[PDB]
Design an enzyme around this catalytic site. Structure first.
Site, short mmCIF file in Angstrom:
data_model
loop_
_atom_site.label_atom_id
_atom_site.label_comp_id
_atom_site.label_asym_id
_atom_site.label_seq_id
_atom_site.Cartn_x
_atom_site.Cartn_y
_atom_site.Cartn_z
N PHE A 208 39.61 23.03 40.17
CA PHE A 208 40.80 23.33 39.38
C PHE A 208 41.83 23.93 40.33
O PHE A 208 41.50 24.80 41.13
CB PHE A 208 40.46 24.30 38.24
CG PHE A 208 41.50 24.35 37.15
CD1 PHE A 208 41.64 23.30 36.25
CD2 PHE A 208 42.33 25.44 37.02
CE1 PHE A 208 42.60 23.35 35.25
CE2 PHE A 208 43.28 25.50 36.01
CZ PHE A 208 43.41 24.46 35.13
N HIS A 211 46.95 28.25 39.90
CA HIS A 211 47.67 28.53 38.67
C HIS A 211 47.75 30.04 38.50
O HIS A 211 47.02 30.80 39.14
CB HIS A 211 46.96 27.92 37.47
CG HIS A 211 45.60 28.48 37.24
ND1 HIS A 211 44.52 28.17 38.03
CD2 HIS A 211 45.15 29.39 36.33
CE1 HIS A 211 43.46 28.84 37.62
NE2 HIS A 211 43.82 29.59 36.59
N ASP A 213 47.43 32.65 35.17
CA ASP A 213 46.84 32.58 33.84
C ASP A 213 47.90 32.78 32.75
O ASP A 213 48.84 33.57 32.89
CB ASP A 213 45.78 33.67 33.66
CG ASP A 213 44.46 33.31 34.27
OD1 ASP A 213 44.30 32.18 34.77
OD2 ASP A 213 43.55 34.17 34.25
N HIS A 267 45.37 31.83 41.57
CA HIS A 267 43.98 31.61 41.95
C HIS A 267 43.61 30.17 41.65
O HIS A 267 44.32 29.46 40.93
CB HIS A 267 43.07 32.60 41.22
CG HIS A 267 43.23 32.57 39.74
ND1 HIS A 267 44.33 33.10 39.10
CD2 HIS A 267 42.45 32.04 38.77
CE1 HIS A 267 44.21 32.92 37.79
NE2 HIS A 267 43.08 32.28 37.57
FE LIG Z 1 42.72 31.23 35.70
#
Ligand SMILES: [Fe+3]
Ligand SMILES: CC(C)[C@@H](NC(=O)[C@H](CS)NC(=O)CCC[C@H](N)C(=O)O)C(=O)O
EC number: 1.21.3.1
Length: 328
Positions: A208, A211, A213, A267
Site C-alpha cells: 500500500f 498516504h 490517514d 506512511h
Molecule cells: Fe494509514
C-alpha cells in the site's frame, strides 16, 4: 533503511484520576507526535489475544458465497447502500488483501442519521450467526472496548496541547461517532501475484502506497510481522512490530486543527509474504462535529484556518484516498 524511534507509552494513567501522572503521559504523547508521529500504547487493558484469534477464525472460514452477500458496492452492484461497511474482496491472482469493515453498532434503521440518509452513515452487515457463531457479538464488544481506549488517548492528546482533557473527547460520542473498525487479512501466497505488489520511487516493494490517514487519530493492532514505514526528511524508516501494543498516529484532521503542529505522518506498507492481520480503528467524530483550529505555537493560539465539519472532511477524504491509492 534505518529504524524509527517509536516509544512505548504506558497509557494506564489516562484511565485514572492522578492528574500529574496524566500530564506525564501527555508529555510523552507530545514528544512522539512532534518526532516521527507514532507511538505504542501499552498497558491498555484490551484482550488482543482474543481479538486476533476471533478475527483469524472469521477470515479463514468465510466462503465466496458469503463474501458476495456481504460485499460493498465496489464489488457488488446490488449493494448501492454499502460504500463503507461490508466485505472488501480479494481478487485471486491480482489483489491479495481482503477486509471487513464495520461502523458504529448504534447505526440502525431507527437512527435519525440513517432515517435522513446522511452520507457516510450506514447500517452494518453481518454474516449468518449460525455459520459464524459469536462473531457479531465479539466484533460489537470490541468496537466499544477500543472506543474506550480511544477516548482515554484523546484526553492525553488534549492535555498535550494545553487544552482541558475533554477538548476532543466531548465530540467522540457513542450515539454518533463515524469511527470504523477494519479487519484486514494480508495472506501468504505462493506464488505472490505481481499485480498486488507496487514498486515505490525508491525501489521498495509495497502493498500500500504512501498516504496520510483520514482520521483524527488511528488506533492500530497488528500481528507481529514488520511492515510499516514512516517518512522522515531523511527517508523512510521501519516501524518495529509489537503484537501486544496498539500503534497510534494522528490523521489529517488533527493536522488541520493544530495548524500542522501535530502532523499526520506519511506512511506506507511494505510487501511481506506472510499471513498477518492489520486491525485499525479509525477515530472519527460525528457528522456535524466542528473543532475551531488553533496554533499551539502562538501565544494567543490564533489560527487563520477555516473550521471544517468532520462529516465533510470524511466524505472528501475517503474518496480522495480511494482515488490516490486504489480501491481496497
Ligand atoms: Fe494509514
Ligand atoms: C492500516 C491499513 N491501511 C488502511 O486501512 C488504509 C490506510 S490507513 N485505510 C483505508 O483504506 C481507509 C479505510 C476506511 C474505512 N473503509 C471506512 O469507511 O472508515 C493497512 O494495513 O493497509
Amino acid at each position: 533503511v534505518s529504524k524509527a524511534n517509536v516509544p512505548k507509552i504506558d497509557v494506564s494513567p489516562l484511565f485514572g484520576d492522578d492528574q500529574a501522572a496524566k500530564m506525564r503521559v501527555a508529555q510523552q504523547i507530545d514528544a512522539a507526535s512532534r518526532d516521527t508521529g507514532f507511538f505504542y500504547a501499552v498497558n491498555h487493558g484490551i484482550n488482543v489475544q482474543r481479538l486476533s484469534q476471533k478475527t483469524k477464525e472469521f477470515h479463514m472460514s468465510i466462503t465466496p458465497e458469503e463474501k458476495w452477500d456481504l460485499a460493498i458496492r465496489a464489488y457488488n452492484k446490488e449493494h448501492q447502500d454499502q460504500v463503507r461497511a461490508g466485505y472488501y474482496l480479494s481478487i485471486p491472482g491480482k489483489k491479495a488483501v481482503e477486509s471487513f469493515c464495520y461502523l458504529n453498532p448504534n447505526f440502525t434503521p431507527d437512527h435519525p442519521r440513517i432515517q435522513a440518509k446522511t452520507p457516510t452513515h450506514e447500517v452494518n452487515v453481518w454474516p449468518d450467526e449460525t455459520k459464524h457463531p459469536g462473531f457479531q457479538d465479539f466484533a460489537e464488544q470490541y468496537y466499544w472496548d477500543v472506543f474506550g481506549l480511544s477516548s482515554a488517548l484523546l484526553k492525553g492528546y488534549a492535555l498535550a496541547l494545553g487544552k482541558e482533557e475533554n477538548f476532543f473527547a466531548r465530540h467522540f460520542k457513542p450515539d454518533d461517532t463515524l469511527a470504523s473498525v477494519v479487519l484486514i487479512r494480508y495472506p501468504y501466497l505462493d506464488p505472490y501475484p505481481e499485480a498486488a505488489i507496487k514498486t515505490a520511487a525508491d525501489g521498495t516493494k509495497l502493498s500500500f502506497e504512501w498516504h496520510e490517514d483520514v482520521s483524527l487519530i488511528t488506533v492500530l493492532y497488528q500481528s507481529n510481522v514488520q511492515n510499516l514505514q514512516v517518512e522522515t526528511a531523511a527517508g523512510y524508516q521501519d516501524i518495529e512490530a509489537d503484537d501486544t501494543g496498539y500503534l497510534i498516529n494522528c490523521g489529517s484532521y488533527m493536522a488541520h486543527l493544530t495548524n500542522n503542529y501535530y502532523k499526520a505522518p506519511i506512511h506506507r506498507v511494505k510487501w511481506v509474504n506472510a499471513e498477518r492481520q492489520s486491525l485499525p480503528f479509525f477515530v472519527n467524530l460525528g457528522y456535524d462535529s466542528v473543532i475551531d483550529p488553533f496554533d499551539p505555537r502562538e501565544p494567543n493560539g490564533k489560527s487563520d484556518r477555516e473550521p471544517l465539519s468532520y462529516g465533510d472532511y470524511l466524505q472528501n477524504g475517503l474518496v480522495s484516498l480511494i482515488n490516490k491509492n486504489g480501491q481496497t
